[PDB]
C-alpha cells in the first residue's frame, strides 16, 4: 500500500513550491475541502525526503517554503482571506511536524498507524522554532490587517449610529464579525486560536470606544449610556452564538461596561461615590476624573457634577496609585501561544487533487 | 495553581511581549533590507 | 505543583534563550543594514 512518498524533480523544486504557494489561492475548493492541503503536501514531501535521507534537499525545501511564505505575506499581506489561509497552513504544518517528528510526548496521544509515519532520520526542532517565529509574525500581521479594517468602522457603527431596539450600524459590526468568524472557521483555525483572535479584536474595539467617548464631551450623555450597554449586550449574545465566553473577551470588555455603568449611576451623594470607587476597579483614576469632569446634562433635570464630588472621588481613590496614562493602548497586542492540536487525518490516504495540477508530484 | 501560574505568567507575558516587539523590529529591518536590495538592483 | 514549576522554569529558560538569540540576530541585521547604507552613501 502506498505510504504517500512525494517524488519530484529536484532541479525544478522551486517551481514545485511556487505551484504550491505562489500559484495556489485560498479560493480553490480543493484546499477548501480539508483545511491544510498545502501543509499536508509539504509535510509529506519532507517525510519522503527523510526517507531519501537528503539533509541538503530538505534544507533547501524548508528555506524555499519560508521565503515563499514571506514573499506572499509581503505582496499579498493585505488580503484577509489569504493571510488567514496561510495561518491555517502554518498551524497545520506545525501540528503535523510535532505529531510525527519523533518526540514521544507527541505520540503519547497518537494512533499506531500515525506512529508508523514518524520520521526517524533526523529532527527539526530548530526548524520548529523558526516556524513558530514566522507564525507569530503572520499572527501580528493578521491583527494589523483586522485593526486596519475595523478602524473607521467602530466610530460610526458604535457611537455615531443611533441603535434602534460610509454609514455603519451595530448590525453592520455584527455582520462583519460573523463574516470574520466564518472565514476563520472555513480556513481551519484552531478553536483556541479563534478564541485568542476574538479576544484581541474585542479588546481593540473596546479600547477604541473608550478612547472616543473619553475624548468627546457631547458624546458623553446619560442617554447614550443605555445605548452603549445595549450594544455591549448585543456583542455578548453574539459571543453566546459562538459559545466563546471561555475565550475571555468579556474580560477585555468590563472597562467599557464600568464606564457605562458609572455614567448611568447617579453621582449626587458621596455614599454613592464610595460605591462607584469600589465598582470602577478596572478604569484608572485618570479616566474616572476626566469622565466626571466632562459629563453633560442632556436634559433639564440633570445637573452638572459638583467640584466637591470631584474632590471626594480624587481623595478616596488616591490610594490606588494608578498610572497617569489617559488612553488605552490601541496598538496593544496580547501574547499568543500555539497549543499542539493533533490531527486524526490518515496521512497516506490523502491524495493530490487534479485542480492543483501537481503532475510532477508523483505519489508512491 | 492559579497563584503560582499568575506569578510566573506575569514575567512570561512580559518576555513574550519583548519577543513580539523584537519580531516587529526584525520585520522593519527586513523592509529596510528589501529597500537596499531594490537600490542595488537600480545600479 | 512540582511538574508545573518545572515546566514554567523551562519556559523561562526558553524565553531567555530566545530573547538572547533574537538580540544577537538583531545586532547582526543592524550591522548588515548599516554596511549596506554606508555602501550606498
Amino acid at each position: 500500500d502506498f505510504q504517500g512518498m512525494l517524488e519530484y524533480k529536484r532541479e525544478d523544486e522551486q517551481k514545485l513550491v511556487k505551484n504550491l504557494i505562489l500559484e495556489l489561492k485560498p479560493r480553490g475548493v480543493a484546499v477548501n475541502l480539508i483545511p491544510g492541503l498545502p501543509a499536508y503536501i509539504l509535510f509529506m514531501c519532507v517525510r519522503h525526503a527523510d526517507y531519501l535521507n537528503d539533509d541538503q534537499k530538505v534544507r533547501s525545501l524548508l528555506t524555499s517554503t519560508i521565503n515563499s511564505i514571506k514573499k506572499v505575506l509581503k505582496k499579498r499581506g493585505d488580503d484577509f482571506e489569504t493571510v488567514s489561509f496561510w495561518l491555517s497552513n502554518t498551524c497545520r504544518f506545525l501540528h503535523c511536524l510535532k505529531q510525527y517528528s519523533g518526540e514521544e510526548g507527541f505520540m503519547k496521544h497518537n494512533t499506531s498507524r500515525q506512529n508508523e509515519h514518524c520520521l526517524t532520520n533526523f529532527d527539526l526542532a530548530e526548524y520548529r522554532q523558526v516556524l513558530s517565529d514566522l507564525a507569530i509574525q503572520i499572527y501580528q500581521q493578521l491583527v494589523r490587517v483586522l485593526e486596519n479594517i475595523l478602524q473607521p468602522m467602530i466610530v460610526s457603527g458604535m457611537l455615531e449610529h443611533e441603535t434602534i431596539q460610509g454609514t455603519y450600524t451595530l448590525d453592520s459590526i455584527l455582520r462583519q464579525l460573523n463574516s470574520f468568524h466564518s472565514v476563520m472557521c472555513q480556513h481551519g483555525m484552531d478553536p483556541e486560536l479563534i478564541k485568542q483572535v476574538v479576544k484581541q479584536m474585542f479588546y481593540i474595539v473596546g479600547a477604541i470606544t473608550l478612547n472616543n467617548l473619553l475624548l468627546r464631551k457631547d458624546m458623553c450623555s446619560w442617554s447614550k449610556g443605555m445605548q452603549i450597554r445595549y450594544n455591549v449586550s448585543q456583542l455578548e449574545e453574539w459571543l453566546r452564538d459562538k459559545n466563546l465566553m471561555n475565550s475571555g473577551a468579556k474580560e477585555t470588555l468590563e472597562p467599557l461596561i464600568q464606564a457605562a455603568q458609572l455614567l448611568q449611576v447617579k453621582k449626587k451623594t458621596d455614599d454613592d461615590a464610595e460605591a462607584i470607587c469600589s465598582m470602577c476597579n478596572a478604569l484608572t483614576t485618570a479616566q474616572i476624573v476626566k469622565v466626571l469632569n466632562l459629563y453633560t446634562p442632556v436634559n433639564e433635570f440633570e445637573e452638572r457634577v459638583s467640584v466637591s464630588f470631584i474632590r471626594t472621588i480624587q481623595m478616596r481613590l488616591r490610594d490606588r496609585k494608578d498610572s497617569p496614562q489617559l488612553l488605552m493602548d490601541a496598538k496593544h497586542i496580547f501574547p499568543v501561544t500555539f497549543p499542539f492540536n493533533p490531527s486524526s487525518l490518515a496521512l497516506e490516504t490523502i491524495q493530490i487533487p487534479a485542480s492543483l495540477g501537481l503532475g510532477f508530484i508523483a505519489r508512491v | 495553581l492559579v497563584e503560582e501560574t499568575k506569578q510566573l505568567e506575569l514575567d512570561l507575558n512580559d518576555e513574550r511581549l519583548r519577543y513580539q516587539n523584537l519580531l516587529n523590529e526584525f520585520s522593519r529591518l527586513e523592509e529596510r533590507y528589501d529597500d537596499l536590495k531594490e537600490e542595488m538592483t537600480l545600479m | 505543583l512540582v511538574e508545573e514549576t518545572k515546566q514554567l522554569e523551562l519556559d523561562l529558560n526558553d524565553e531567555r534563550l530566545r530573547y538572547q538569540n533574537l538580540l544577537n540576530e538583531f545586532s547582526r541585521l543592524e550591522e548588515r543594514y548599516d554596511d549596506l547604507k554606508e555602501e550606498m552613501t
Partner: peptide, 12 residues
C-alpha cells in the same frame, strides 16, 4: 542566510 538554520540528526 537571514536566519541561521541547522538540521539536528536523530540518533537511532
Amino acid at each position: 542566510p537571514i536566519r541561521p538554520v541547522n538540521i539536528p540528526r536523530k540518533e537511532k
